[PDB]
Design a protein around this ligand. Structure first.
Ligand code: HEM
Ligand code: HEM
Ligand SMILES: C[C@H](CCC(=O)O)[C@H]1CC[C@H]2[C@@H]3[C@H](O)C[C@@H]4C[C@H](O)CC[C@]4(C)[C@H]3C[C@H](O)[C@]12C
Ligand SMILES: C[C@H](CCC(=O)O)[C@H]1CC[C@H]2[C@@H]3[C@H](O)C[C@@H]4C[C@H](O)CC[C@]4(C)[C@H]3C[C@H](O)[C@]12C
Ligand SMILES: C[C@H](CCC(=O)O)[C@H]1CC[C@H]2[C@@H]3[C@H](O)C[C@@H]4C[C@H](O)CC[C@]4(C)[C@H]3C[C@H](O)[C@]12C
Ligand SMILES: C[C@H](CCC(=O)O)[C@H]1CC[C@H]2[C@@H]3[C@H](O)C[C@@H]4C[C@H](O)CC[C@]4(C)[C@H]3C[C@H](O)[C@]12C
Ligand code: FES
Ligand code: FES
Ligand SMILES: [Cl-]
Ligand SMILES: [Cl-]
Lengths: 359, 359
């Protein structure tokens, strides 16, 4: 029977094959929301054509593409299965995948959602900690769609735009940390240094008032509270590119640094993503734990397992939708405040769209 | 009877009267734990003489000196009053102030504590969130003291080196924030934006692994949680001095931005300090609220009152000490990890000084 409530799961692209790498980059270089370049429509097609081989090469290094869709899918099903039991008033629930930069694109998902004649649509960011350059970019795409199509939504909307401390999210991270610790030589357990590694931001974004760091930082505290401070930690940032200043310390430097100081047992915990992707399988596992770690003489370096197929995360997702629905909330309070320095007009419009929603 | 357990209360401190300003800047500028100056021993006395007028001037605009000492004193007394009741086993307790840059210097307090033959000494940072440039420097001074005097301590030492999420600390902040909201026009309560404001750090420090920003962010979350996200917020940083890059956004810049974008009801919350001082009474109340707020046409700006005399803060302090004693702890787990990139040969020495303590 007919799907009633629709859960839009938002996330950035991940090219599924080396073939999709080009269009991936192209859509990436076109997003005003994440970068203004001179004469953008002209540069992007070229920058993409230029960086395709190297990225291809990275994906090939991890087996030939991104597993983002596969994990979102399974996490999706799990969510739906549970929601259909905890919230039966919301009839059958359906999940859709709105990726920013690869198919199914956000726009395509919305088309499919409209057509299934849903009663209510929920924008569920897959980013627990809110950045304008991630969740905001995804929220903007929804608004822009309806303002490009020219008509307007035939279903009522709302957003779960952040969830950096959801209790089951935290429990998942801790569980995966505990079990990653059990694989460390028992004589070295107490001595394991934990590095929470998050995708970095450029300072120019940080300095504009982006909430990301503060949220990532909360996530980190909650986790360590639950672990009862069993090991010393730091929060470090990865994936810097370019010559500009980014928020540090860089994860590559911290690993290198810790080593030189004789802290040679390191647990990497990727705390800002809910599944594997290039950042973990290439950046962390290959560039860092295999090349870097090696030439600095680490004793042991492990990476806590991405949430991926964990059934408990699947519960987490369901529990968030459920609560969101019951609470009748349209978005978080935080969404209703733009960053005291955006130069971007759509941020207000996009937030209007969610706070102005009927019901 | 004689004092059994001493509770060393560490803080930067500030000039009590205008005359202390020169000596205050002098000791700031000679502290090779936040400053490497060419021929530092000769620039410093001078930089002091040059900056003295303007800083005196600032202190004059706030009544002619810092209250850090009065308040630390009152907190000290209340703490002791309770602790004698809470832990009679640890006999009479006595507090000492050890300021870093003004009298009573860390080193004086130490001479005194030792002169009263205490069985133990607790280094109790009054900065809830750890920075290498604040609590660390205070800890470095204790270790350095013994290395200088060339003797060993006659009392058993330990430390409460951080406490960013103490339940009562959090509770006091919540209370003070609520109290301040009832002072805003009622028609505007739930439109008020909360700007948590904290002393900034130079990126060069952030970038070497300083724990502070992540700890400050943690404190913010706990306060907002307990407030039940009743108002939008941002975490922002104040007190940038110089041409170098600091962690932003800057508090001032953020206030102006908010104003230029129609958010004209701001509550400042000083989240990284336990009492009033220059940062709050001059920077926040005068520079930002009284001047900046007029040129950018704010409607209402307000500041949550510093913890100062709050009786519940005193209870907060006692709980911390008492729990630290019951727990038998030498330091936080977090102190045992120096920040992955420091270049300061002393951090590990200090750390060892506390992790290595007898009893
Ligand atoms: C304004 C802020 C951001 C900017 C400017 C930015 C920039 C970029 C750039 C240049 C790439 C291409 C990667 C490369 O060519 O080396 C990329 C890809 C990517 N971005 Fe972001 N990023 C931002 C924030 C984030 C955050 C916080 C995340 C968290 C997951 C994220 C997720 C990803 C992922 C998974 C890729 C794959 C890129 C690749 O496979 O090479 N982005 N971004
Ligand atoms: C490397 C780290 C830091 C550096 C290099 C630094 C620099 C300075 C400077 C230059 C002054 C004198 C004011 C001036 O000369 O304009 C000062 C004083 C002061 N510091 Fe810092 N600061 C740092 C971190 C912090 C932090 C995190 C806090 C509190 C959390 C703090 C608390 C204070 C206070 C209350 C004053 C009094 C300033 C005055 O009276 O003018 N400092 N520091
Ligand atoms: C990574 C890429 C360089 C591609 C290459 O030559 O390999 C560069 C070129 C243009 C860059 C972007 C542009 O400089 C615009 C943005 C400006 C901000 O100050 C930094 C981030 C910012 C969002 C940049 C991210 C990244 O460094 C980009 C995308
Ligand atoms: C200064 C400017 C960013 C302007 C802005 O942020 O508004 C920079 C950032 C990214 C740069 C471009 C990208 O790096 C891609 C190209 C790479 C070449 O190495 C230089 C030219 C190239 C075409 C760059 C031109 C120019 O230097 C850009 C456009
Ligand atoms: C380059 C050096 C910073 C050294 C460092 O990286 O630690 C800077 C920072 C502070 C500077 C000094 C102090 O600001 C005091 C003086 C102020 C005058 O404006 C210039 C000369 C003056 C005597 C400065 C000389 C020099 O440019 C210093 C010493
Ligand atoms: C405040 C004073 C400038 C006063 C003047 O010249 O009139 C200067 C002299 C030395 C400076 C410091 C030194 O350059 C060393 C520190 C290093 C960081 O990169 C900046 C903060 C840092 C702590 C500086 C802050 C501030 O600008 C200081 C303290
Ligand atoms: S860029 Fe953060 S709200 Fe506009
Ligand atoms: S500077 Fe942080 S431990 Fe040395
Ligand atoms: Cl990926
Ligand atoms: Cl002061």
């Amino acid at each position: 029977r007919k799907p009633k409530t629709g859960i839009l799961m938002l996330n950035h692209g991940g090219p599924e094959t080396l073939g999709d790498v080009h269009d991936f980059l192209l859509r990436l270089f076109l997003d005003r929301d994440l970068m203004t370049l001179p004469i953008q429509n002209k540069l992007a097609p070229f920058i993409a054509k230029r960086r395709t081989p190297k990225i291809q090469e990275q994906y090939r290094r991890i087996g030939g593409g991104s597993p983002i869709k596969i994990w979102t899918s399974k996490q999706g099903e799990g969510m739906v299965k549970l929601l259909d039991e905890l919230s039966p008033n919301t009839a059958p629930h359906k999940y859709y995948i709105g990726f920013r930069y690869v198919h199914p694109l956000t726009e395509e998902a919305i088309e499919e959602m409209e057509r299934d004649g849903l009663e209510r649509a929920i924008a569920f960011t897959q980013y627990p900690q809110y950045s304008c350059s991630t969740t905001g970019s995804s929220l903007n795409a929804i608004y822009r769609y309806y303002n490009q199509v020219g008509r307007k939504p035939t279903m009522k909307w709302s957003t779960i735009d952040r969830w950096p401390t959801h209790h089951l999210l935290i429990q998942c991270f801790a569980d995966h940390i505990l079990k990653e610790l059990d694989h460390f030589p028992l004589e070295k357990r107490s001595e394991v240094v934990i590095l929470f590694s998050a995708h970095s931001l450029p300072m120019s974004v940080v300095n504009r008032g982006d909430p990301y760091p503060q949220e990532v930082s909360a996530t980190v505290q909650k986790v360590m509270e639950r672990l009862e401070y069993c090991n010393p930690y730091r929060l470090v940032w990865q994936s810097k590119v370019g010559p500009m200043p980014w928020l540090g310390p860089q994860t590559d430097e911290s690993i290198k640094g810790l080593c030189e100081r004789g802290r040679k047992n390191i647990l990497l915990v990727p705390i800002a993503f809910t599944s594997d992707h290039i950042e973990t399988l290439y950046e962390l596992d290959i560039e860092y734990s295999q090349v870097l770690a090696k030439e600095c003489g680490v004793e042991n370096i492990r990476r806590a397992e991405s949430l991926n197929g964990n059934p408990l995360f699947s519960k987490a997702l369901a529990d968030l939708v459920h609560s969101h629905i019951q609470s009748n909330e349209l978005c978080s309070k935080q969404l209703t405040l733009s960053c005291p320095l955006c130069v971007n007009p759509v941020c207000r419009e996009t937030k209007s769209f969610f706070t102005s929603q009927q019901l």
